[PDB]
Symmetry: C2
Subunit: 323 residues, 2 copies
């Protein structure tokens, strides 16, 4: 029925066409320390975030899920500024990143006191049911993340807390999987702790090119997200070409009602601006919010993927997920 | 001659009695994510920070070095608020924490770009010679930190950049050593890259109880800091009793002109307030800024440590270090 967005409750019925995973802002933990050479430019950042939204609106998108981790520069008030001037619905997350590129020293310390898993649960329930800080904005999803080849002890605290919060709230869980690993493990651990698979999206599933691995995750009844379209060359990634092959195989095998598509873009980088080195730069040049609609979809159509299938992925699935 | 404080340049001559290592604020990276349940209380925090200063002033202290890492919630403007209302001199740092409990993902990413060591140097030179963000405050020291048993590849970028900045600036280096390790290694690596040992303080040297280890560091001509007084039970610590034995041995062996004393207090914790379990809580109850003057010094006096020796440690050495 309802979902909390950065502008308050919105019926699921009106989410319409949705990108299930994009970042308006994102910073790697430690960006804070680089303030002198990388201060946040409040207003140009907004110009840039607004323009990003207006772009997706040109392709029909009405709703964006932004699962930027709490420890990766999540800024719900800024999201709200984007939404109050675009009419775009934006649903944000509560959750921390994977141990690998998240900021684990804080909750690792609290684990030493013996309160971390409870404190995490409390944070989830606060941000889902009351508000994030003093913004009045509620997260609509819980973001979970795990490392390569392993859901670490640290990560597991968040997984258990999330299953806990979901049972209390029915909030949707969206995950990050690292380098094409732990998809089935994540599904199984969440389900072992009473999470509802119809309210779970295992993310970055396109990172793997073994259809066995995908079907192994699908068996749990969760959603899977091909949400990294355009990221190529960099950080143990497949190519968009491989993503398309893998995707086509699953659609022709009848899995459309469990698949969602996105880019995982980062539209404004927190901290010091940078330029990618040329090998990576050219491979990554298709990493923008227009990419699915201008490059990917047309390829799938020319593969015979029918309009109703596309609409199940972009409209029907997000509706089903949040309702 | 001169040193930058949070209130601007101050002649070294007037630093007077000094604690070389304390934190008014400190947060473990990730504290940022706990904002909903852990927001920074701007004005009570200041009441608390001001009161902390007023305390140290009752024991003669005129100057405090606060080497809170950039990635551990360093806030120079807040320091300046403390100083403009206490008359206390506060000298702050530019530097990042050790890989273990700092926030390495940001500069690890830039290392992948090939620019991290140069970007770090640039940050040091900016904060030493121009200003931290838009506060106008210059760091007076460079903070370095290393892990247990290892100066990691990540940490080394900061060590090299620092030696580089020191050569350009003559800024003082203050280090953190983890669990009584890497003291001689740190000294040797900095010196190998052209740092001046008369402008280096190897910190947390009290973490080790082998006087061989101490003398092995001292041979480089650097300062060493017994800066953790009051911290026991936790995180590999020795007891204040062991600290005193180790300290006494070095003073009676004539090393007073290379030693400085402090508590490494955290007076306001960033993020969610907390309490500690009984076992650790009582072996930590002496972890306050009055501890040196009310407990430690009296013990050393009753050991025959003469007033002139105490004055060399608290007054003479800091003067020598910064001049
Ligand atoms: Fe993401
Ligand atoms: Fe410290
Ligand atoms: O991501
Ligand atoms: O410390
Ligand atoms: Zn991710
Ligand atoms: Zn330290």
């Amino acid at each position: 029925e309802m979902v909390e967005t950065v502008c308050g409750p919105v019926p699921v019925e009106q989410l319409g066409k949705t990108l299930i995973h994009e970042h308006f802002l994102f910073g790697y933990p430690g960006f804070q320390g680089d303030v002198t050479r990388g201060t946040f430019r409040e207003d140009e950042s907004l110009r840039v975030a607004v323009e990003a939204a207006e772009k997706m609106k040109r392709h029909g998108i009405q709703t964006v899920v932004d699962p930027t981790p709490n420890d990766c520069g999540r800024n719900p008030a800024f999201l709200r500024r984007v939404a109050e001037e675009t009419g775009l619905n934006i649903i944000c997350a509560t959750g921390y990143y994977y141990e690998g590129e998240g900021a684990p020293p804080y909750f690792q310390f609290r684990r030493l006191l013996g309160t971390a898993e409870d404190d995490i649960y409390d944070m989830f329930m606060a941000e889902l049911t009351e508000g994030i800080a003093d913004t009045g904005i509620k997260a609509g999803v819980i973001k979970l993340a795990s490392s390569k080849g392993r859901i670490t002890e640290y990560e597991k605290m968040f997984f258990r807390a999330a299953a806990r919060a979901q049972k209390e709230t029915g909030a949707v869980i969206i995950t990050h999987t690292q380098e094409g690993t732990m998809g089935p493990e994540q599904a199984a651990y969440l389900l072992e702790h009473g999470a509802d698979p119809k309210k779970i999206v295992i993310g970055h599933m396109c990172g793997n090119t073994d259809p066995d691995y995908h079907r192994k995750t699908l068996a749990y009844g969760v959603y899977i997200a091909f949400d990294d379209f355009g990221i190529q060359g960099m950080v143990g990634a497949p190519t968009d070409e491989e993503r398309v092959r893998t995707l086509l195989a699953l659609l022709r095998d009848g899995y459309e009602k469990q698949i969602m598509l996105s880019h995982d873009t980062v539209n404004v980088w927190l901290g010091r601006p940078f330029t990618l080195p040329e090998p990576f730069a050219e491979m990554m040049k298709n990493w923008h919010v227009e990419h699915l609609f201008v490059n990917i979809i047309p390829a799938l159509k020319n593969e015979g993927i029918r309009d109703e299938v596309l609409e199940q992925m972009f409209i029907g699935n997000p509706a089903a997920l949040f309702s």
